[PDB]
Amino acid sequence: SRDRKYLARLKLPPLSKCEALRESLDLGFEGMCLEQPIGKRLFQQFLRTHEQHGPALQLWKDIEDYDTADDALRPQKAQALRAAYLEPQAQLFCSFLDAETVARARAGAGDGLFQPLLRAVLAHLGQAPFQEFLDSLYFLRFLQWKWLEAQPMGEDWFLDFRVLGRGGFGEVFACQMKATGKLYACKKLNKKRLKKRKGYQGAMVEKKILAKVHSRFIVSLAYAFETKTDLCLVMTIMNGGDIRYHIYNVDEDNPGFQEPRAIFYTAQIVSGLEHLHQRNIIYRDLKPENVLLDDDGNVRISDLGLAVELKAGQTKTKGYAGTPGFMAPELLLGEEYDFSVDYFALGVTLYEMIAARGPFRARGEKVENKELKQRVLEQAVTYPDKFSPASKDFCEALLQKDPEKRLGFRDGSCDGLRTHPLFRDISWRQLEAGMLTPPFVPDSRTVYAKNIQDVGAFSTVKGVAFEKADTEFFQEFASGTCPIPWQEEMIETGVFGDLNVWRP
Amino acid sequence: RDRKYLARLKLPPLSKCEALRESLDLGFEGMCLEQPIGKRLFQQFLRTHEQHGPALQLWKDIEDYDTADDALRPQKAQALRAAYLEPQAQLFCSFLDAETVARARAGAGDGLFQPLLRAVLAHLGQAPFQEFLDSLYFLRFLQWKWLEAQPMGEDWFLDFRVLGRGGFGEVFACQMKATGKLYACKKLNKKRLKKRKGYQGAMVEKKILAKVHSRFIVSLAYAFETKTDLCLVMTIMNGGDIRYHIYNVDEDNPGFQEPRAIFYTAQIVSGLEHLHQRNIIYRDLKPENVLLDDDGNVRISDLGLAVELKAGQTKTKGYAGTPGFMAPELLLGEEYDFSVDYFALGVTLYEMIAARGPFRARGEKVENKELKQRVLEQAVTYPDKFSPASKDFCEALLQKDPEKRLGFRDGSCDGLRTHPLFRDISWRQLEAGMLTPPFVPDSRTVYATVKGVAFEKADTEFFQEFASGTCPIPWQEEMIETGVFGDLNVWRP
Numbered sequence A: 001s002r003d004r005k006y007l008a009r010l011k012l013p014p015l016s017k018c019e020a021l022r023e024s025l026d027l028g029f030e031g032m033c034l035e036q037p038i039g040k041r042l043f044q045q046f047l048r049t050h051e052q053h054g055p056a057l058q059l060w061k062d063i064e065d066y067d068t069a070d071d072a073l074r075p076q077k078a079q080a081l082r083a084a085y086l087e088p089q090a091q092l093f094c095s096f097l098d099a100e101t102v103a104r105a106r107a108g109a110g111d112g113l114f115q116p117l118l119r120a121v122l123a124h125l126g127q128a129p130f131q132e133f134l135d136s137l138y139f140l141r142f143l144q145w146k147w148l149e150a151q152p153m154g155e156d157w158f159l160d161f162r163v164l165g166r167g168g169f170g171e172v173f174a175c176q177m178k179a180t181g182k183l184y185a186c187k188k189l190n191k192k193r194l195k196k197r198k199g200y201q202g203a204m205v206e207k208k209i210l211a212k213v214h215s216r217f218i219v220s221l222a223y224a225f226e227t228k229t230d231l232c233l234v235m236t237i238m239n240g241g242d243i244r245y246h247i248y249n250v251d252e253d254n255p256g257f258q259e260p261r262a263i264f265y266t267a268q269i270v271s272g273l274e275h276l277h278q279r280n281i282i283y284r285d286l287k288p289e290n291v292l293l294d295d296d297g298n299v300r301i302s303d304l305g306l307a308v309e310l311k312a313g314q315t316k317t318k319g320y321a322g323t324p325g326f327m328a329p330e331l332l333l334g335e336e337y338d339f340s341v342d343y344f345a346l347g348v349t350l351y352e353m354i355a356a357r358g359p360f361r362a363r364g365e366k367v368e369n370k371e372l373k374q375r376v377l378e379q380a381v382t383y384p385d386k387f388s389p390a391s392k393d394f395c396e397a398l399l400q401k402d403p404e405k406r407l408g409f410r411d412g413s414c415d416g417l418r419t420h421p422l423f424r425d426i427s428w429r430q431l432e433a434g435m436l437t438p439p440f441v442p443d444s445r446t447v448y449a450k451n452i453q454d455v456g457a458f459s460t461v462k463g464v465a466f467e468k469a470d471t472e473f474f475q476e477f478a479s480g481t482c483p484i485p486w487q488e489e490m491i492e493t494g495v496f497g498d499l500n501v502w503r504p
Numbered sequence B: 001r002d003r004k005y006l007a008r009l010k011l012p013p014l015s016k017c018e019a020l021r022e023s024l025d026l027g028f029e030g031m032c033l034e035q036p037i038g039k040r041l042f043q044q045f046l047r048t049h050e051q052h053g054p055a056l057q058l059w060k061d062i063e064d065y066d067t068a069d070d071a072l073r074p075q076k077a078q079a080l081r082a083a084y085l086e087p088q089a090q091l092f093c094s095f096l097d098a099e100t101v102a103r104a105r106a107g108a109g110d111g112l113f114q115p116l117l118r119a120v121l122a123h124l125g126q127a128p129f130q131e132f133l134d135s136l137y138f139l140r141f142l143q144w145k146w147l148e149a150q151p152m153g154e155d156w157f158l159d160f161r162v163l164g165r166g167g168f169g170e171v172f173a174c175q176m177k178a179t180g181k182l183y184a185c186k187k188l189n190k191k192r193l194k195k196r197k198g199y200q201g202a203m204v205e206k207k208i209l210a211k212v213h214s215r216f217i218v219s220l221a222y223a224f225e226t227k228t229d230l231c232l233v234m235t236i237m238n239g240g241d242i243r244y245h246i247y248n249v250d251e252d253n254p255g256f257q258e259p260r261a262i263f264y265t266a267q268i269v270s271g272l273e274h275l276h277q278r279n280i281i282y283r284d285l286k287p288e289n290v291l292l293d294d295d296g297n298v299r300i301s302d303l304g305l306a307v308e309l310k311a312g313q314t315k316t317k318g319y320a321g322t323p324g325f326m327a328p329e330l331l332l333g334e335e336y337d338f339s340v341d342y343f344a345l346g347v348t349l350y351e352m353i354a355a356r357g358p359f360r361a362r363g364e365k366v367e368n369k370e371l372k373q374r375v376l377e378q379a380v381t382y383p384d385k386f387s388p389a390s391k392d393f394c395e396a397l398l399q400k401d402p403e404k405r406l407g408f409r410d411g412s413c414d415g416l417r418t419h420p421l422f423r424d425i426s427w428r429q430l431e432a433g434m435l436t437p438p439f440v441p442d443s444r445t446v447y448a449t450v451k452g453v454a455f456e457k458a459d460t461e462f463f464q465e466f467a468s469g470t471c472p473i474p475w476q477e478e479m480i481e482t483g484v485f486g487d488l489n490v491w492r493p
């Protein structure tokens, strides 16, 4: 669906309006033509209309097709690619490539196949062809879309229609971007409630981190804005409830998951952790209640309000933050730590997925923080029959008290962690490209949340008048529209194709 | 098409178009109405901005009406009126005033929607045009204007047949290699031109053909030099000249039946009008200079004796032309204007019907002074082959006193188009090239050394001036006609 009044506000500007934007824009190849979907699209259209660039473009497309193809189709696709682009007599022979590069891509069947070739294709495209793009009408059209992207799109642009979750500080709504029809979730954090409980830093950290990360295993931020009452984060719609809910509340007499299902989630969570750790961000809040399912059954991590982004030269942070019983010993002992803490929380998360209780507490046990801290430091975890030898070994490797001994991020990746035999039946390629059929597909009829009639109301916040510092802070927060998700939306909903006209 | 030269037709990077942008001095009329590529890009612009849809479609439908077969007109008028002009019309043009609308809804006739079109184009020339200049479409126009100015000299043209030989040179049938378009190429030998002092005539012809754009005058498309020649690439006229058709087609029956002569006269008149409206006197109208194309439509050619009057100047002097076709005022060494061309039209027409000139008997060669004496002093007689109308028309054109001669008045030949000779000509269809010509030439029919010359600065410089390159309107037409423009105007295949 759509609404035509808001749709009518999506129009491409005159060129003279784009002059300021052109001078202040980052012209990096990677940032413009590879990472930004409208940039990439316009760059490809440019390549498509200039014959000399056809081989490069088509090779690029055919590598991406090979990368995301079923295992059964791959050998044949590799044969066709080779014959089309890497045979010297072929119509679309890629003669710009180094002969060495061509000879290596003609050989082998290993998991690395065509990655080096792709790097050479993109390194070529980044030179003269990109320079021609910049001097073409397709680059100017990109500026028009960037101008449109930067226009005011706050609260009036969204139509809520249902509550998805809520906590102490506000609600998450399923909403609709009125112009395009795209379904999103909107986190509304109440201003007064946040001022009272000193929650500003957390709201800001999450917003910044979600704006700059782009991963299929982490919820994305598409817009950020304020209203009279709230600070609003418009993000990936996740309809399927959180993992805590699916452990305890769904099939109550069978709490916890079968092992294949828990392994799948674990793999998806690992992939999202890795994405953060490669960007030097420590999550610090991994737990079942912050892992969310979408409609297809795939999961994403969420709530980045406690995350730390390391600066260059900094390998560790420090401090008490997170949830009792997901916090690692190094953290509880007051030591500096890196990403290791997230993998300890991964262990606790998996334990709970299989066992339907924490590893440091009995069912329903509520203990003093100091007693819980002692158990985490000193008490060996025990595993019931529900754990297979591989489940158990993996948990043991993550719940290792010494961070140096714990499985995790090494040599810039989680590749070592992936060889653990727990994951022996996971095709990582298809996992990372979102191709694997999930183990549980949520029901469209069903609300995976607390019944609205059973939600405790919160008292009103009295006498928190807003000073200048609050209002200035609200304006910093409301940085508006995030480029990559906004471009994805325009393309997905057909607005791009509709407005990207030339000769109707 | 030849891949090799087709490959050279590539749109430039935008940065290469900066100088052109800076020096280009075009208004709405020059850019979006008169230049076929600007008009096309301007219409493309309008088609993508929904608010300009009514104006764009109305414009196209008027032009569609103007060039429609008479049988299709009642219904085209009907549909246009119901779509744009009637009270709750879906494509109502609110920018028009009510008087313009009411009048366009009333009546029939030829200029039925001319006032309306004038109003549509005046509106489109204001804000819609300004918006166009701030669009990608205008930049694309600059890119085509850049391509238009690139060197396209002799190597771009394949010769394949001789169409005529003259004194100064030859006309070849040729083919633009990149587009495959057929043209005629007139090559004037440099050394003969110098030795016989024909520079003036070559330059004058080139300038004039470059600044005229009529379906009744050979169109100049490219002008360039080679080592041996000055070349003019122009409308291919394959069907022979009128002298040839009068005297050589059916030898036992020379001359044309009257309706055929009148058709050609109407076309000739329209060419003359086009020159006289631009202040040019032709001065060499005669059957040998009027050529037929493949369809049997004619155009005037050989503008080497022409003269363009300076702004303000209304008469000129100078002995030039062909004996028998020169008017008395010219023969008498007086100042003259466009009137000389009309005298020559009378002679031309007379000869089309009579298969001889009005002043000499069949095969009769006379001293120039005996012929001068006749043109100045003798009344022309008319054999029985002339209807009263054609005699009356010839008489009016052959008046010895230019003040009494039928010709060009009030900026046009409308007064002349009114003569009863032309009662069966539909001027609209003629002016538009829709009328089925009376004679259709066959393809299978072939209707048809200098020493001691050394060149200097002054010569090679004259040569370089002459090689001005490509003429915008005919080039743009070529690009559209042959599909090159369409091929290089795609955004997303």
Ligand SMILES: Fc1ccc([C@@H]2CCNC[C@H]2COc2ccc3c(c2)OCO3)cc1
Binding pocket: A164, A165, A166, A167, A168, A169, A170, A171, A172, A185, A187, A188, A189, A219, A235, A236, A237, A238, A239, A242, A289, A290, A292, A302
């Ligand atoms: F302010 C707050 C509101 C709601 C909560 C929820 C409490 C229970 N566990 C999940 C928490 C996050 O809820 C969601 C649900 C769907 C979403 C989403 C986040 O982002 C994309 O789609 C936490 C904080």
Ligand SMILES: Fc1ccc([C@@H]2CCNC[C@H]2COc2ccc3c(c2)OCO3)cc1
Binding pocket: B163, B164, B165, B166, B167, B168, B169, B170, B171, B184, B186, B187, B218, B234, B235, B236, B237, B238, B241, B288, B289, B291, B301
């Ligand atoms: F240099 C010269 C060559 C030939 C002549 C010819 C002499 C006989 N009568 C007509 C003269 C014009 O010849 C043509 C023929 C085809 C044409 C053309 C002109 O222009 C476009 O296609 C004049 C001058």
Ligand SMILES: [Cl-]
Binding pocket: A135, A136, A137, A138, B011
């Ligand atoms: Cl371009």
Ligand SMILES: [Cl-]
Binding pocket: B134, B135, B136, B137
């Ligand atoms: Cl535009």
